[PDB]
Amino acid sequence: GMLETPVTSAPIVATYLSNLPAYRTGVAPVLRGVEIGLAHGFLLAGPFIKLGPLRNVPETAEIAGSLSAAGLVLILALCLSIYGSAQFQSTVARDPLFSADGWSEFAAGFLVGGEAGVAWAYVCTQ
């Protein structure tokens, strides 16, 4: 039926994907959101810091970059919240993340983790 290849059938990549927080299937959604948010905010703080309009002025490039990354994390959190509200409206085991309450807790955890990751990336450059 479907096409099987070593890229999608290797046990190493399957274990790597299963080790990711999104494919844990059994932990609290807020913890998953916190982990994903931290991992995303830490990498997100970089481009705004090194390439923004205030990248050449000293003592404020990191400030502006971190604030921009924080705003982006806030926008992504709002996107996650509206996605959860418009996706789960009615109706192994079923993952609790794919539910209204689960996705709302996931979005809140993502917001907290993203802001913490941005703040940690800002102090890591000092």
Place this chain on the structure above:
Amino acid sequence: WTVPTLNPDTPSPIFGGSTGGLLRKAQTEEFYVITWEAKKEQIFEMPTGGAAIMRQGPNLLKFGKKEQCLALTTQLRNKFKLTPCFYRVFPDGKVQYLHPADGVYPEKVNAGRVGANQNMRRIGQNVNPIKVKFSGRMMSPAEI
């Protein structure tokens, strides 16, 4: 003639797989299953792309839409002179026989068929849209 029943434990043609197969619609909405009888092992073209080998005897295949099943039916009837039949399967397990609905192909007239959507007039005798205006919804004069 009696309506056939789907046999889920039916061998499928020899195919190595492709990327044009079933999608999430088969697991969440519905899918289609086509079955046929082959007199010998023969290579045919899959409607989703590629070449498969139908085995001698029963053959079962799954498709995402009814058009793929009818295209395969047309290919098997016109080339190998076979008689395939398909069903619509739902995720709950319900099976609905689709074609040939009455056991006889629709191109040839069969007794017992009740005509549907037949207008006992010609096109030029259709009324103007003004007489159909302010109805329940957008209605064409041919619908009355």
Place this chain on the structure above:
Amino acid sequence: ATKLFPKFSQGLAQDPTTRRIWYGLAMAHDFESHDGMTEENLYQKIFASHFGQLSIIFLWTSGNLFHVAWQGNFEQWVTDPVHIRPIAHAIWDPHFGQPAVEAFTRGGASGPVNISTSGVYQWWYTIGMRTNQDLYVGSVFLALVSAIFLFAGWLHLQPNFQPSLSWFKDAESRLNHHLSGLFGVSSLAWTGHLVHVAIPESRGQHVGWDNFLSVLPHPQGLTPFFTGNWAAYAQSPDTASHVFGTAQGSGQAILTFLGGFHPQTQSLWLTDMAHHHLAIAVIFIVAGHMYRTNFGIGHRMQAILEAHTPPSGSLGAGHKGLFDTVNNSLHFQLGLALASVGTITSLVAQHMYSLPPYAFQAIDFTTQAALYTHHQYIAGFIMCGAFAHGAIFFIRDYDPEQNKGNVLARMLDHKEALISHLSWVSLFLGFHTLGLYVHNDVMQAFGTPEKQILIEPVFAQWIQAAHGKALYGFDFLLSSKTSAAFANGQSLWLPGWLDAINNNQNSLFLTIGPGDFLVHHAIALGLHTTTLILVKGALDARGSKLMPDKKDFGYSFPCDGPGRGGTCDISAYDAFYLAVFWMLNTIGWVTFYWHWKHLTLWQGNVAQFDESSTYLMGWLRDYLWLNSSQLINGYNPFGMNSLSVWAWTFLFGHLIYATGFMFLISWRGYWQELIETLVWAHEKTPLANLVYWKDKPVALSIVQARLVGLAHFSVGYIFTYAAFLIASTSGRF
């Protein structure tokens, strides 16, 4: 499952694809196609929509007034309206760098601002506005009017306030009130404002709400009006040395018909405009007593229509049954209204550039060009809509049984003759205009400019001579000093009109030559071809030989399939669709002609246009290539100036136009197959398949694709020409 949106269509709410949102957005105002819609409910929804539209219009006007009063320089522009550029509003953009900040900081403001090109400064100055307080009060008043209109729209939908269907069909009462009240009384009130405020403010006398009850508009105070000595209001007008806004050289008259223009402002006299509004107010009020409503006297439009059939039967039944097919069809009324409004918009553009009504408007070249182009494009779009609604009327509301033998049925009886003759006129005009152009281009290329065909427009020049222009030397009617028409107006309005028309420095009946003749034929070709497409689409809307039952498929449908040879773009919607391109081309030709003739006029070299408008190479080089040098130099590697926004808008319009060509050339199928591959890619990708779509992704429909491509084409067209026109006219002057 079934979605809530759209609430007006149950079939669209059950659509599981992305087409549901697009179709719900594009069919929101098609109330006739909504679920469970009746005639009474239809009229009530249109009533509420009308009130909402008025609320939006008034709020937009109040916004313009507020921004000019807040971030503008109206108080400084009134002191020197010749050397001071008007300010639209301030600019607050964090993306601006330092050079952009000092580049847009101009006009005497303390920060970056936009120079207005709408001409509201001249209009407000002419009607009486002098300070920012006046604009602030007007803005607050219009905001209150907008809120009142919005509340009226909401109130007329609630029970005990919804009008019945019979009230909406009282054509006689509505026409009487619109002619006498909406037109006549409004014009009379405008005359009262001009006589009471505009005229005294133009003479250096402040007349506001605090002193208009103690200030006389005329020194005789209503006595000549009641005694019939109306000529006393035309005595002692403004002299030729009157300074606008001051009492130096001012007069005492309030109702004159001097004609011509003011020697300083180069605009129409305020007393003449007041007298004009008074005369049309009396005429409209009198016309408002023609129909019979509730007092026995008056007319019934059905009787006048039924009693207007020729005896020989040349028009068949005449206009019998035309009252019912118009009163019961909203598309017929909308088409008539749009046709008249489009023609009036074109009339406004022509009269506004030729006879400037606002003070110091002719000197503002950018304002004149922008206003003319804006009104002509609006008129073209409205005309296309009028014909589109005529086609919609033929499909949805035309009844051959009720309109049996009248003029309406006879139009469809010989529609082939009309379409064939429109085709012949368009073919003749196109072949000859293009042939003369290519001939002149070959003559100019071979170095023989004396061999090109230059037909003098003797008919239009003859009309210009009839109006009083003595340049051509016809010497007849107003051009002859011994004619009865000339001698009968020498004491009322002919001196000023003749002095203004014989002046070659204004836009009042400009001198024309062979180039004007050729471009006028190009305009005729554009009008005839656009009319041919629209008329053919309206007449073939109910059917043709290829699709005998086209009326059973509605006004807009994709096609009838590839059978019978192919039926792409067979609906009337597609006819309007193809006609929009021709409308844009026609308005482009008229605006190109207007801008080039006025650019050569303002630059002081009309010979450039007279010698380069006879061949297309002159149009491409001396008008498009030459006038775009400053535009494309708005931003370059050496820096930028205040004209960089127009350069960015120029490239913006080019990009939108080219993006439209994509929806115009490539069709659905390719995109649908590509989207299917994208669906497979998203479904087979880890860490991303956990996020699924709510609507199934599908390619845009055929009709939607046409609409999207046309919208991009029109937006790019408009933005590109607007940026070029404003940048060239502002940079040159």
Place this chain on the structure above:
Amino acid sequence: TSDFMVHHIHAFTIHVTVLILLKGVLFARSSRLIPDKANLGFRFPCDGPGRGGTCQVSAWDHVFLGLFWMYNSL
């Protein structure tokens, strides 16, 4: 830098032309939209306004669009 940008522009245009031509070759016989495209031939206008619209599904139309993209690239 300008040479780098124009080279990437060339690579992008060539890739889009390859995408249209390759899509027209691979999906010439069948696709998820029309499973019997090979029966309709190589040069056919469409398969009707059905399935939302099947305008320009033939391989000929892919060559028709590839010509425009080749013109743009070159």
Place this chain on the structure above:
Amino acid sequence: DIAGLTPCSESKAYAKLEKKELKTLEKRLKQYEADSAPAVALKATMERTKARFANYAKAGLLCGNDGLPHLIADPGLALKYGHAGEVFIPTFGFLYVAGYIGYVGRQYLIAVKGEAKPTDKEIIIDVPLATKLAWQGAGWPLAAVQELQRGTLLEKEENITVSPR
């Protein structure tokens, strides 16, 4: 004269343009020999330019402020000031040749419509019939007027197909 124009024989811009054209031609000729092919060709072009300017001035054409001839399309002005050769006589000349072509084509279609395969005659032109009709088409206005007066020029409304309205 008409529309404030001046005759080309008295226009200063007309003579100035003639001098400019002859000047650029002479300037190009100054780089060649005196008995070579480019010299002879340039001299022929100069003579043609002089003859063209003299012929246009002799014809009585009206020149504008640009020094270029202007045509008069009004029949009254053209016949009153001797300008019928610009737009009047060429108008009737085109009408004669155009009606000639249309009449010959119509006669050929009517002649081949009564045969076994008219489409075959439409793709493969019958040269003898076409030549005979082309020669007989000289009296197209008289024949057309006679056909219109007899009622055989037009077809009845009942014999022409129309849409279902």
Place this chain on the structure above:
Amino acid sequence: AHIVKIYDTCIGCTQCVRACPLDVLEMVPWDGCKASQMASAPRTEDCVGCKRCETACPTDFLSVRVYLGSESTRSMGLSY
């Protein structure tokens, strides 16, 4: 779903049924023509609107008509 209608001008040539790619039409007994058959549309819920049946109809004007109506997963021919 699309609206498929059969008219009395049908000659029972069965060309529309053979050209249908989703088995929407069929043949039923009739007495109004020489073929003693008439086209029918009992499975319009599966019609996509390709209009192949109209292309295959030889009567003037057509005896089978397809009016595009509401769109669903089946009418849009979506396999996903």
Place this chain on the structure above:
Amino acid sequence: MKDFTTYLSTAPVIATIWFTFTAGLLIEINRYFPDPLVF
């Protein structure tokens, strides 16, 4: 020879010969009567 004349009587060959004749006539008229603007 009959088939060859029939081939020469086809629409493209006839159009080519006729347009060559008409173009040659116009070119020769403009050659012997250079620059004709008015009658």
Place this chain on the structure above:
Amino acid sequence: PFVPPSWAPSVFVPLTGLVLPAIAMATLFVYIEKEAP
């Protein structure tokens, strides 16, 4: 007087450009995808 403060554009332009469209887009997106009972 009706004159707005000097800081009015610095507050209204970012509001109308980013806060109001985000709220409007979010509310509209939730309304479009809401399922009927």
